[PDB]
């Protein structure tokens, strides 16, 4: 549940929780090229690749 992303300079920001990531995503700060991962993930992935592979990003909330 520990999210990281790379900023435009390549610096790794985080960890952030699901709610913080979801808020920033809904506010529009993230393009689908933003590179994200949790500590437990294999590699950074752009949000768009996560969407193409899973149909959703894990931090998106819902029922």
């Amino acid at each position: 549940q520990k999210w990281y992303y790379k900023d435009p300079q390549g610096e790794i920001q985080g960890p952030f929780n699901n709610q913080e990531m979801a808020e920033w995503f809904q506010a529009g700060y993230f393009t689908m090229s933003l590179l994200v991962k949790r500590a437990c993930d294999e590699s950074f992935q752009p949000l768009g690749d996560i969407m193409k592979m899973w149909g959703r990003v894990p931090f998106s909330p819902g029922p």
Binding site: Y5, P8, F16, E23, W24, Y29, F30
Partner: peptide
């Protein structure tokens, strides 16, 4: 609400 560290909006 703060912006994401390393991003500005």
């Amino acid at each position: 609400s703060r912006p994401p560290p390393g991003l500005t909006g």
